[PDB]
Design a protein around this ligand. Structure first.
Ligand SMILES: Nc1ncnc2c1ncn2[C@@H]1O[C@H](COP(=O)(O)OP(=O)(O)O)[C@@H](O)[C@H]1O
Ligand SMILES: Nc1ncnc2c1ncn2[C@@H]1O[C@H](COP(=O)(O)OP(=O)(O)O)[C@@H](O)[C@H]1O
Ligand SMILES: Nc1ncnc2c1ncn2[C@@H]1O[C@H](COP(=O)(O)OP(=O)(O)O)[C@@H](O)[C@H]1O
Ligand SMILES: [Cl-]
Ligand SMILES: [Cl-]
Ligand SMILES: [Cl-]
Ligand SMILES: [Gd]
Ligand SMILES: [Gd]
Ligand SMILES: [Gd]
Ligand SMILES: [Gd]
Ligand SMILES: [Gd]
Ligand SMILES: [Gd]
Ligand SMILES: [Gd]
Ligand SMILES: [Gd]
Ligand SMILES: [Gd]
Ligand SMILES: [Gd]
Ligand SMILES: [Gd]
Ligand SMILES: [Gd]
Lengths: 259, 274, 259, 274, 274, 259
């Protein structure tokens, strides 16, 4: 069972809900910009939160915009925005547009430009070349990335975008790591020790570490049979060690040879 | 609450009124071009001024003129000019044509797409209307009767050098909107008019963030309900928050206005900028 | 009655006339580049001079070139040049091409490039892609702008462009301001005092000041009736103050809240 | 001679073997994306690994996917996936689909031409295959039987941000290849394994050029035959050298392996870099 | 007045004469490419040289080759080559084909338009003519008789790297024209030959503006008539100046040559540069 | 009879031959980059070497690539490469692709990019948009230029390109200059003196000097007849001086007025 950090869940839930309330005399930022080191569960925890709140999400990947092969990223964002706006009026539920891994320089400008224009009038979002007298719904936008260009400063400053820095703290790690290894028969104190052993590491390192433990088996199994005859043999059965000792050496081999 | 900057109201009231008078000895510009930065309450101050003088507004949005689906923008501007003309005659009141965001996807708002406002055709159209505000006809039409002069308000971030001939001839007047300290104290004071702040604290707040737009200050007042909102979410529970806010069955949540200080606003402000 | 500054009228008249004389052993600059602070009557005084000399002018606006919406500025200049060249042969009169407010960086280069090429051979000016064995007439070109790019240095240097700096002096102001207020029943000494009161200001400030005096009336008239009922009232009759006292306070309100 | 870096061999052997096992409790990524710089023996270490495990490889080259003449690249990748599937079934051995140079003409290898790998369609295809590796059909075909899961190896210099969803879902695993000091000592040692060099001299050679790719080191060993070659040209004579080397009548020239020292390699290296 | 720089005249006279001689032991280049900066009297020194040797010139302008309306430029160059050939035969005198401004809208003279000189087709054509100057036929024509070799002079600011093969084969010779101090003293001296200046003052004038083109110096002499001109305008009156200068009824105004000094020229020069 | 410098002939011959040998365990650079001051016989000596070894050469000029008028330089290189690859399989002889005068910035990148890609796989060189399962032959590429962009550093470094600096030394000059004047009845000691008199000069200066001697005649002949009547006269017969004294003054006039 995966673990969503309470203050992460709050920030995101408050942002979305605040966009669907129409408290007069209170302008609301349309965009939530979640930034921080890569692989700290920005995307994963958003998805946890949405599943929990029963929110349907329209998802664009950052690579879908940074690439020359995708043509027009302004169009794509505006298409998905208007699409999510209709799903609100239809399903009568909270819906969200999400852009992932927003961290090229040329498409980056167009993307910033597009989000600025949408945030300026979340209700009058037209496809380029098109015009529709119809107001459409305001759709809260969640964005993730390593940091946000100084080109986003004007948005944050005028309260059209809310920045949120995500750096898991140790209670947050114990919870998330605890969930990563929740099916591996571990006690909290083993979980607390694991986190304290690798304390500058990203959440990603820890889920990588879990997969590595399975890889180490398969490696040894291959060394035993020999490479010469591994193919015939297969064309690795047991529950691996997972003891806290083994997770640590496995982690140290990862950190001694990483990236 | 909302504060109308006297000089914004004067400029716009004088421009419109002057267009309904036939004072000799001076040329009256038909067009008032209001330019300046975003988040300073331009279109909004216009709205407060119109709502106040009881002025009825025909609108053209910049995303309208940016579109083929508005057809010929020359034809559209003329249409709405004529449509707007019939109402001074019919309703017997001051009416205004207003064109908003006359430079939609330009500069830092450029999305790098095939479509942009044909601004030269727009300029050309306004020039033609302005030379003879009393005979504005659709292209290809010739035998219609004279009509009433309609003052035109255009907003944008800046106006192209193309508008220079209009200005040079006194057919258009640029009005730059950058709120000054006195303006900000007024507007910001109105934003925090129910929060039990002294005049001096409002002056302090403005002086603490001398480079910020008006929108920075109202954005600032907005983030403090967040706690009530979060708590409201916890009470209803995450499993059922969606149903609660969007299905309009039971009543909207009733939020109290919170208490805060100058100190807290300044702190919040620095966090936003840091 | 508007006032043209004698040395402005001379410079321009000498340039044009010099281009229509064919004094052998004397090469003549084709381009007159008039530069200076904005709103000092560069354009207005050119127009005064042309009206006076009975010169027909072909006018291009700088914004007509700086804009992406106008396509090809080289073409446009060359079209208008050849057009003015024909009007000489037809009307048998002095004709002039004028480019206004030349102060983007990309079109600016093409414009400079176009004027260089034309100035190099004022008689062989072909539309791009076209060729015509026919010589056409030499057409003097007047250009205005705040300053001229270092890209114009080669032209000025080889005597294909004459630079002329325009900064009205006080005799020039008294004359021009005197004409701006010529119908407002003012004595020279009131005109001389007005100019001396606002002495770093552009001519533009002064014609703005005159219009402001009318605006102040209409303002007060609106304050009296009230905004609530101004619309019905109209759907401001008298000759405004214009006393030298009133022009001064009006000017000081303009300079205390300008741009 | 050739040295297989243990950890390269382990990563690739584990990835492939893991794809032929049905171990529960963990998701097995179908795709192994091997990225890193050029001239570090990537595709080559893969070849040594495949030749070793007796693994048969179906290939797609990046210049294949860059071409209309490969038709639809989605259709091609699927074809070769299915073609590669039939062989695990038929030959009863481990088989791999491998896509090489997945970013052919991008970055410093850009030739500025109309054609580039439609990498989004490629990504989309791999995503679809990966969700269901057991039912991979050509577009427009529906009623074929299940097939065998095929591990996929892709090489490139870097992988687009588009592959992030594949990785995030554990359908793909990135493996960065930058040879470390221990790797280089191994590989370089194998390059100079017949040249009578001590372990220490090999360590010295590596440490003298710590920033160089593997290809720099073998390039270095190659230029020393040049003298034998020149002399061979002088003997045959320039008039007849062409006939001699290309017409395969008489036998290929037989060159001796020369003697050289660490000192000479280092000198040669500095000349190449200077 | 006009001064012909001896070495310009020698280079061009030798190039042309050499092309009408059949001296063995050396290859004669058909083409003389004269390059260098604008405003240095290139085309003009050519004109003085041709007028002097009694050489008749067939011309192609760069704006001709830039145009579809010249049709195929390969066909045109060949036409004029043949046209120019018939005259050495008919008139019995030296004749030259001259191509001017061979790089019309390139570099700082680029107008950013669809049309530019197809310079590769031009180069290709000159290459072909040069290999066989005696059989130059229009494309698609085959059975014409031999003709006379025509020396070709081309001017431009620089010559593309494409002309390298022509030069390498001695079919073309580049001649760079940058006036040196001795040249300038000559040319400038000729510009001011009627102004009662000593040799030393001319040397001083040249040395005061060592970086300026020849055109800077004649531009300088030109602006001093301005006063006579202004006064002439005042006499006739602004109302009637247009009629006077352009209608060729009464006679052209007769201007006197004014008196001026080195001091005044230098001052004027600094004002122009400042 | 023209003279090829022995070490120039060696370097080039060794490079080409080395590309046609398939000595296992020896990777061979495909590209030979010959760089140095302009006009030192880089191109000319390549051509001498090819004529000597009976090598047919496919030649591209650098200007054929640097120009906007030639469209696609990647294509052009790849076309010529595949063409030379076929001539090997057909003629059964050594063939070479040569690129001359490679010393705009935009095409320069594409050219570098193209040579990198070809050098990476000399056997799988496809036209853009095309694919052919067929291996084609490895074609050694010779390139000349004044220097090679830092963009070529990766190639040289990974042994896909061999750099070769060409600066003629005095034995090299005596040989080459000796051949330039081989038909002018000169002794070596006159040749040695000529080279020592103009010792910082390029080989180009010397072949220019030879042509100048003929030009000086024709000049004097023109001065005698007079320019006024040179045309009629012609519409310069003798073997010119060529004495070592005359070559020297002719050289000094060239160096006193050059470029
Ligand atoms: N709350 C979580 N529970 C379990 N695993 C997680 C959690 N957050 C992150 N992970 C693991 O770490 C990886 C990286 O998370 P991701 O959302 O991609 O980080 P970011 O969005 O900050 O780059 C995921 O692929 C997942 O396996
Ligand atoms: N000679 C003049 N007489 C009367 N008004 C003038 C005169 N010159 C300028 N003005 C006023 O000042 C304004 C600015 O002049 P303009 O020619 O636009 O200046 P510039 O060309 O230097 O920018 C004009 O719109 C006009 O109202
Ligand atoms: N080996 C040689 N023999 C005779 N002449 C030569 C020789 N090398 C160069 N030249 C002369 O010098 C000129 C310049 O040589 P080139 O090959 O163009 O130099 P680079 O290729 O270095 O620019 C040639 O046009 C030729 O006349
Ligand atoms: Cl601030
Ligand atoms: Cl190194
Ligand atoms: Cl100078
Ligand atoms: Gd990540
Ligand atoms: Gd109508
Ligand atoms: Gd105060
Ligand atoms: Gd401000
Ligand atoms: Gd102005
Ligand atoms: Gd199949
Ligand atoms: Gd060691
Ligand atoms: Gd390295
Ligand atoms: Gd003919
Ligand atoms: Gd002297
Ligand atoms: Gd000079
Ligand atoms: Gd050369």
């Amino acid at each position: 069972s995966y673990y969503i950090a309470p203050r992460f869940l709050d920030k995101l839930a408050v942002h979305i809900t605040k966009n669907f309330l129409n408290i007069p005399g209170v302008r609301v930022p349309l965009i939530l910009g979640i930034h921080g080191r890569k692989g700290e569960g920005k995307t994963f925890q958003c998805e946890l939160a949405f599943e929990k709140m029963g929110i349907e999400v329209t998802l664009i990947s950052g690579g879908e915009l940074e690439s020359p092969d995708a043509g027009d990223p302004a169009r794509l964002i505006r298409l998905r925005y208007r699409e999510t706006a209709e799903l609100i009026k239809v399903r009568g539920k909270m819906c969200v547009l999400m852009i992932n891994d927003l961290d090229y320089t040329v498409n980056t400008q167009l993307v910033n430009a597009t989000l600025m224009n949408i945030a300026d009038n979340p209700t009058d979002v037209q496809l380029p070349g098109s015009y529709d007298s119809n107001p459409i719904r305001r759709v809260p936008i969640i964005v993730t990335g390593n940091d946000f260009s100084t080109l986003y400063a004007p948005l944050i400053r005028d309260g059209r975008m809310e920045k949120f820095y995500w750096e898991p703290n140790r209670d947050d790690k114990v919870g998330i790591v605890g969930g990563i290894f929740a099916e591996d028969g571990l006690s909290q104190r083993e979980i607390e020790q694991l986190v304290d052993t690798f304390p500058k590491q990203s959440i990603d390192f820890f889920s990588a570490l879990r997969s590595r433990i399975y890889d180490i088996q398969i490696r040894d199994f291959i060394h035993k049979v020999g490479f010469e005859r591994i193919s015939l043999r297969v064309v690795e059965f047991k529950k691996p060690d997972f003891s806290l000792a083994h997770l640590i050496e496995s982690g140290n081999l990862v950190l001694g040879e990483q990236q």
